[PDB]
Amino acid sequence: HPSRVFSMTERPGHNFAQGSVITTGRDLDVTIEGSGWISVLDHTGKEGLT
């Protein structure tokens, strides 16, 4: 009989809504207006979005 059904928790995605913008007056502080990413390479060297 089909009586036993398991459930597993999984990550379906991420929340890509715009984060809270903090005005700091610093020249080297940048925030992406709307959607978009900054391409950076980590310690190993593989590129990725941040």
Place this chain on the structure above:
Amino acid sequence: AISFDNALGIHQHTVGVRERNAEVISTNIAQANTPGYKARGLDFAKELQAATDKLYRLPTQPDTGDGNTVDLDLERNLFMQNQIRHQASLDFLGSKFKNLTKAIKGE
């Protein structure tokens, strides 16, 4: 006539089958937790034919990844029934000799 085969009937074989059945049920209960073990059932009519086998039990519920098809609720009931019937077979076969001895000795 007048031979032990006819005097004892089939009660001489039933006691053995009830012992084999009890062994299989004991195996099923012990192997209930070991994954991959398939519950074994004994067909009574087969040992009846052998007197005059070791099958598999199809589960009523799915496994949980173990593959073990032993239902401990079923095994306890089947072990209780076999033990009760085993004692009756001893009573039946035991009285066969008690009547047989009384006929010979006349007392």
